[PDB]
Design an enzyme around this catalytic site. Structure first.
Site: not given
Ligand SMILES: *[C@@H]1O[C@H](CO)[C@@H](O[C@@H]2O[C@H](CO)[C@@H](O[C@@H]3O[C@H](CO[C@H]4O[C@H](CO[C@H]5O[C@H](CO)[C@@H](O)[C@H](O)[C@@H]5O[C@H]5O[C@H](CO)[C@@H](O)[C@H](O)[C@@H]5O)[C@@H](O)[C@H](O[C@H]5O[C@H](CO)[C@@H](O)[C@H](O)[C@@H]5O[C@H]5O[C@H](CO)[C@@H](O)[C@H](O)[C@@H]5O)[C@@H]4O)[C@@H](O)[C@H](O[C@H]4O[C@H](CO)[C@@H](O)[C@H](O)[C@@H]4O[C@H]4O[C@H](CO)[C@@H](O)[C@H](O)[C@@H]4O)[C@@H]3O)[C@H](O)[C@H]2NC(C)=O)[C@H](O)[C@H]1NC(C)=O
Ligand SMILES: *[C@@H]1O[C@H](CO)[C@@H](O[C@@H]2O[C@H](CO)[C@@H](O)[C@H](O)[C@H]2NC(C)=O)[C@H](O)[C@H]1NC(C)=O
Ligand code: NAG
Ligand code: CL
Length: 616
Positions: A156, A273, A279
Site C-alpha cells: 500500500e 487483499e 479492518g
C-alpha cells in the site's frame, strides 16, 4: 417459496478450474522492528501449522508484511555494512516446514538502516540487499522453490505506512528498480509484481498508477533501459460487506489498466487483499462462524463463474487472497478476520496458547476438494436462472484420472450465503440433480455440511458462557464443532444420475463428493509432528503429499503408551491434517502414527511412528 434447483452436468467438462484463491496474509503489530517476536512465537508456529494443515495444499501463500524488519545490520554505509538474516531464516523455515510459501513483500528498513529512497547510495545498497536475500534463499531452498514466490513491493504505497522511511513518488520508483535489479541479478527466473494498492481514480493512488507508468514507459534507474519488468499487478479491493462489489471494483481497475497500458494486456492481476470488509481487527459476529466462511466461498464462485469462466473482458485475473492469517485478541477470540481463534490461557503454570479452527478455515478444506476441470452447472428458482450474484450458488468440478492410485471424481460445492447477514430461521430447499456421471467402479458419494447450528465453535463457546480461560473439557466441547457434518459413503444409484434434496440454512455450505474407486489404496502419511500444548495435550500435524487420492474419509490416529499395542484415537471424521489430542486421562507420552482411510474403508500405510515424551 419455490425450491432452488441445481443442475450439474458431469459429461460437460468446460475449461480448466484454477485454484486461484490459495492465499492468506497478515501484518505484524507495533513496533515493527519487533516483528520477529510476533512471527516466531509459539502462537505463530501453531497458527501456521493450522494454515498448512488445510488438505491438498488448500492454502499455499502467506503474504507477510515487514519481512525486512526481520533483517538486522552491523557496521554502516561508510565503514562496511553487514546483514544478519537469522530472524528471516527462522520465519522462512517455519513457512517451509508447513509447506507454505511467503508472499514476499520487500518491505522494511533492515533495523532502521534504510531511511531515504532518493538517496543514491541507499538505492544501490537496497539492490544488493535484495540480491543477497534471493541468492541466500535460492541456496537454502533451491531455485525451483524460490522461483514460485510472489516477490512484491512495499504494501500500500499510497497509504503512507513507511514508518521512518522517506518513500516519495520518485523514491518508490527507485526502490522498485532496485527490487527488480536485485532479483534479476540473482536470477532471471524470479517473479516480481506490485504495487499492492487500491488504484483509485486518478489523480488518486498516484504511486500505484506511477509504478505502472514507470514500468510501461519510464527508464530503469540502474541500466537506463526503457521499460522495467512487472510480472503481475496486485491491487487491493475490499467489499464493504458486499461480495459482488469486490468483483465490480476489480473489473473497473482491470479495464483502466487494459486501456492505458496495452503492454500489460496479458499481465496477471492479483487481488491480494480481497476481503469482505476492511479492518481485520473490528469485531463482527459474522466473522466468527459460517457466515464469513460461506461468503468467502460465494466470492470465489463469483470470480470463477462471472470473471474467469469466459467473458467479453476475459481479463487476466490470477490470484485472490483473503487476508486472514492474523492472530486474534481478547476479548474477541472469534469475531476478528482470522482463520483461527486464539485463546491465551494464562491460568496454567506456565501460561499456554490454544487455537480453534474457525469455519472459514474449514471451508478452505472444502474448496481444496475442487479438481482441475469445471463442470457445467446451472442454478434456478421458479424457472429463472440465477448467476452466482445471488444467495445460492455452486461450483462443480471434475477430475481426469491418472494412475491406479487414482480415478474419476466430481466435487460439487453449494453455498447459501447472504454475504455478512445470517438468517437463523430461514430454510432453503435445494434440489440437486447431477447427471452424466461416467461409468466407473465402486462409485460412491459423501456429503460434508457446514452451518451455524452444527459446526460453530463460536456457538459452542457462547453456549458455555464465553469462558475467558476455557477449561480443557470446554475446549473439547468447542472442537467437536470444527468439522463439517459428514455422511458415510453411499453407493450411487444405478444409471448415471444422483438427485438430492438437502435443506440448507442461511448461511451453510454443502459439498457433495462423488468418487470412483481407484485400483490401489491410499499412500502414506508423511511428516508427522507432535507439538506440546500444555500438560496433558499436544497437536499432531502431518502432510498429505504422498497420500494420492482426495477420496478420503478420515485419518486414523493411533497411540501406543509403554511399547504396548497401538490403539485408535476415537474422534469425528476429519480430513484436516492436524488434530489436537487432549485425552481425559491426560496420558499423552508414547508413540503416534497416522494413516489415511479412504471411502471404501481401505487404509494407506502408517506414517513412521513419532515418539513423544512430556517434559514434566
Ligand atoms: C493473557 O495474557 C496475554 C499476554 O500474554 C494478554 O494479552 C494481551 O491482551 C490485550 C487485550 O486485552 C492486548 O491489548 C490489545 O492489543 C491490541 C493490539 O495491540 C497491538 O496492535 C495495535 C494495532 O496495530 C495495527 O495498527 C497500526 C496502525 O495503527 C500498525 O502500525 C500495525 O502494523 C497494525 O496494523 C495492522 O492492523 C491494523 C488494525 O489494527 C490494520 O488496520 C492494519 O492495516 C494492519 O493490518 C497497535 O496499535 C498496538 O501498539 C501499541 O502497543 C505497542 C506495544 O505492544 C506499542 O509499542 C505501540 O506504540 C502501541 O502502544 C500504545 O498503545 C498501548 C495500548 O494498545 C499502550 O499500552 C501503550 O502505552 C501505547 O500508548 C500493538 O502493536 C490493541 O489494538 C488493543 O487496544 C485497543 O483497545 C484498548 C482497550 O482494551 C485500548 O487501549 C486501545 O486504545 C485500543 O482501543 C480500541 O477501542 C477503542 C475504543 O474502545 C477504539 O479506538 C478502537 O475500537 C480500538 O479497537 C489492546 O491494547 C495485548 O495486545 C495482548 N498482548 C499480547 C502479547 O498478545 C491477555 O490480555 C491475557 N488475558 C487476560 C484475560 O488477561
Ligand atoms: C449483481 O446483482 C446486483 C443486485 O441486483 C446488481 O446491482 C444492480 O446493478 C444495476 C445495474 O444493472 C443497478 O442499476 C442497481 O443499482 C444495482 N443494485 C442495487 C442498487 O442494489 C449488480 O449489477 C450485479 N452485478 C453483476 C456484476 O452482475
Ligand atoms: C544474528 O542475530 C541473532 C539474533 O539476535 C544473534 O543471536 C546472532 O548471534 C547474530 N549473528 C551475528 C553474527 O551477530
Ligand atoms: Cl472481512
Amino acid at each position: 417459496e419455490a425450491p432452488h434447483l441445481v443442475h450439474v452436468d458431469a459429461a460437460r467438462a468446460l475449461w480448466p478450474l484454477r485454484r486461484f484463491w490459495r492465499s492468506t496474509g497478515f501484518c505484524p503489530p507495533l513496533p515493527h522492528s519487533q516483528a520477529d517476536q510476533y512471527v516466531l512465537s509459539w502462537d505463530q508456529q501453531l497458527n501456521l501449522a493450522y494454515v498448512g494443515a488445510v488438505p491438498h495444499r488448500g492454502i499455499k501463500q502467506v503474504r507477510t508484511h515487514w519481512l525486512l524488519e526481520l533483517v538486522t545490520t552491523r557496521g554502516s554505509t561508510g565503514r562496511g555494512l553487514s546483514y544478519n538474516f537469522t530472524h528471516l531464516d527462522g520465519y522462512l523455515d517455519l513457512l517451509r516446514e508447513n509447506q507454505l510459501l511467503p508472499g514476499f513483500e520487500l518491505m522494511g528498513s533492515a533495523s532502521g538502516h534504510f531511511t531515504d529512497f532518493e538517496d543514491k547510495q541507499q538505492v544501490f545498497e537496497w539492490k544488493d540487499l535484495v540480491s543477497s536475500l534471493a541468492r541466500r534463499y535460492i541456496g537454502r531452498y533451491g531455485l525451483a522453490h524460490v522461483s514460485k514466490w510472489n516477490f512484491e513491493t512495499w504494501n500500500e504505497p499510497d497509504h503512507h505506512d513507511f514508518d521512518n522511511v522517506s518513500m516519495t513518488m520518485q523514491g518508490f520508483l527507485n526502490y522498485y528498480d532496485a527490487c527488480s535489479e536485485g532479483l534479476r541479478a540473482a536470477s532471471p527466473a524470479l517473479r516480481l509484481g506490485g504495487p499492492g494498492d487500491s488504484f483509485h481514480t486518478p489523480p488518486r493512488s498516484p504511486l500505484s498508477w506511477g509504478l505502472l507508468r514507470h514500468c510501461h514507459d519510464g527508464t530503469n534507474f540502474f541500466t537506463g533501459e526503457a521499460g522495467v519488468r512487472l510480472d503481475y499487478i496486485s491491487l487491493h479491493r475490499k467489499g464493504a460487506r458486499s461480495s459482488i462489489s469486490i468483483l465490480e471494483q476489480e473489473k473497473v481497475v482491470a479495464q483502466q489498466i487494459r486501456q492505458l497500458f496495452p503492454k500489460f494486456a496479458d499481465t496477471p492481476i492479483y487481488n491480494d487483499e480481497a476481503d469482505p470488509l476492511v479492518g481485520w481487527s473490528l469485531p463482527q459476529p459474522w466473522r466468527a462462524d459460517v457466515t464469513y466462511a460461506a461468503m468467502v466461498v460465494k466470492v470465489i464462485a463469483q470470480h470463477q463463474n462471472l470473471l474467469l469462466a469466459n467473458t467479453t473482458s476475459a481479463f487476466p485475473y490470477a490470484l485472490l487472497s483473503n487476508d486472514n492469517a492474523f492472530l486474534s485478541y481478547h476479548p474477541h477470540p472469534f469475531a476478528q478476520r482470522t482463520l483461527t481463534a486464539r485463546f491465551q490461557v494464562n491460568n496454567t503454570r506456565p501460561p499456554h496458547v490454544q487455537l480453534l479452527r474457525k469455519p472459514v478455515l474449514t471451508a478452505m478444506g472444502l474448496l481444496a476438494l475442487l479438481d482441475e476441470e469445471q463442470l457445467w452447472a446451472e442454478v434456478s428458482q421458479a424457472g429463472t436462472v440465477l448467476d452466482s450474484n445471488h444467495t445460492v450458488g455452486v461450483l462443480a468440478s471434475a477430475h481426469r484420472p491418472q494412475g491406479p492410485a487414482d480415478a474419476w471424481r466430481a466435487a460439487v460445492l453449494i453455498y447459501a450465503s447472504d454475504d455478512t447477514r445470517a438468517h437463523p430461521n430461514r430454510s432453503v430447499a435445494v434440489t440437486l440433480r447431477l447427471r452424466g456421471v461416467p461409468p466407473g467402479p465402486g462409485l460412491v458419494y459423501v456429503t460434508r455440511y457446514l452451518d451455524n447450528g452444527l459446526c460453530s465453535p463460536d456457538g459452542e463457546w457462547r453456549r458455555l458462557g464465553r469462558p475467558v480461560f476455557p477449561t480443557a473439557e470446554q475446549f473439547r466441547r468447542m472442537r467437536a464443532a470444527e468439522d463439517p457434518v459428514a455422511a458415510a459413503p453411499r453407493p450411487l444409484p444405478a444409471g448415471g444420475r444422483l438427485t438430492l434434496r438437502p435443506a440448507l440454512r442461511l448461511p451453510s455450505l454443502l459439498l457433495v463428493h462423488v468418487c470412483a474407486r481407484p485400483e490401489k489404496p491410499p499412500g502414506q502419511v508423511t511428516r508427522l509432528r507432535a507439538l506440546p500444548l500444555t500438560q496433558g495435550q499436544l497437536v499432531l500435524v502431518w502432510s498429505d503429499e504422498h497420500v494420492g487420492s482426495k477420496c478420503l474419509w478420515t485419518y486414523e490416529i493411533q497411540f501406543s503408551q509403554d511399547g504396548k499395542a497401538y490403539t485408535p484415537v476415537s474422534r469425528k471424521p476429519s480430513t484436516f491434517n492436524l488434530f489436537v489430542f487432549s485425552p481425559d486421562t491426560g496420558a499423552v507420552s508414547g508413540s503416534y502414527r497416522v494413516r489415511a482411510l479412504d471411502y471404501w474403508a481401505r487404509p494407506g500405510p502408517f506414517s513412521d511412528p513419532v515418539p513423544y515424551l512430556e517434559v514434566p
